[PDB]
Amino acid sequence: PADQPVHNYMIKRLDRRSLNAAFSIAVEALGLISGENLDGTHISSAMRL
Amino acid sequence: EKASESYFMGQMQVARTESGGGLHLQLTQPRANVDLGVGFTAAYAAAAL
């Protein structure tokens, strides 16, 4: 006897990855960038820049 | 092939933590993927040695 036409279903699950990277900033240079330790001199401005 | 892969990028975000004195900013990005074709859609040949 003939074969009836066949039907089939299939599913694929997701795959999960991630990416990352570090950005560590120094200990003497953010409060010139945060302006806390900034003192008013013609020398510290250049260092903040 | 023309489209051998389905790819989803999540949303970037920052997670930060203090160590090594300074600040340690840590970028992350969750991302997922899953093939988009019945049967194999990629192969290699190993040409040289």
Partner: peptide
């Protein structure tokens, strides 16, 4: 009529720890 927007202020000063360590 007494509870948590100064008891607001009060609990969650919480999500501030760096106040960075870097100049």
């Amino acid at each position: 009529m007494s509870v948590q927007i100064g008891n607001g202020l009060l609990m969650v000063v919480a999500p501030g720890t760096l106040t960075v360590g870097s100049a």
